[PDB]
Amino acid sequence: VVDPPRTLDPEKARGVLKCDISDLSLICSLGYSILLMVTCTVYAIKTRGVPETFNE
């Protein structure tokens, strides 16, 4: 809501369509998901050899 929903010309002669946001916005959005993934990996490696329900 702070930045509601452009043409970018990287040299050459043709401008390409894009969303208003840079890709740094996308990476910052994935910043929380990467923390979730790190937490899940740590929790799944510390348990590891749990033999329940066919070693799930």
Binding site: V50, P51, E52, T53, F54, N55
Partner: protein, 122 residues
């Protein structure tokens, strides 16, 4: 072995047990009446070995990011129910750290190893 039941457990307990059952029937594979049947529970047990084993001892060294060295030992290996357990601890601290508390505990482990089941520790 019988696992301790809960407040609201009603029927047969969990664990492993043995019983003998004598019945009267025309054939073995067809039917067992309640009137013609006697059931008795029998316990298979083990008792303490007569020869004591080695003295239990343990040692660890922890160096942080000069070590801290901990040694622990017991007086004997085989104990009887209701008898005290004496543990001797010896700590040497060459570090600049300070041990605040010493926690000593006796813990039980139970392995349910028929289905794929986690081990019980307490």
């Amino acid at each position: 072995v019988t696992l301790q039941p809960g407040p609201e457990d009603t029927g047969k307990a969990c664990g492993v047990d043995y019983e003998v059952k004598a019945f009267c029937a025309e054939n073995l594979e067809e039917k067992i009446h309640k009137r013609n049947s006697v059931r008795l529970v029998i316990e298979k047990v083990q008792y303490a070995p007569e020869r004591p084993g080695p003295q239990p001892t343990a040692e660890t060294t922890r160096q942080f990011l000069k070590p801290l060295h901990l040694e622990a030992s017991l007086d004997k290996e085989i104990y009887y129910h209701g008898e005290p357990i004496s543990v001797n601890v010896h700590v040497t601290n060459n570090t600049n750290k300070t041990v605040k508390k010493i926690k000593i505990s006796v813990r039980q482990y139970a392995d349910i190893c028929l289905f794929n089941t986690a081990q019980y520790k307490c």
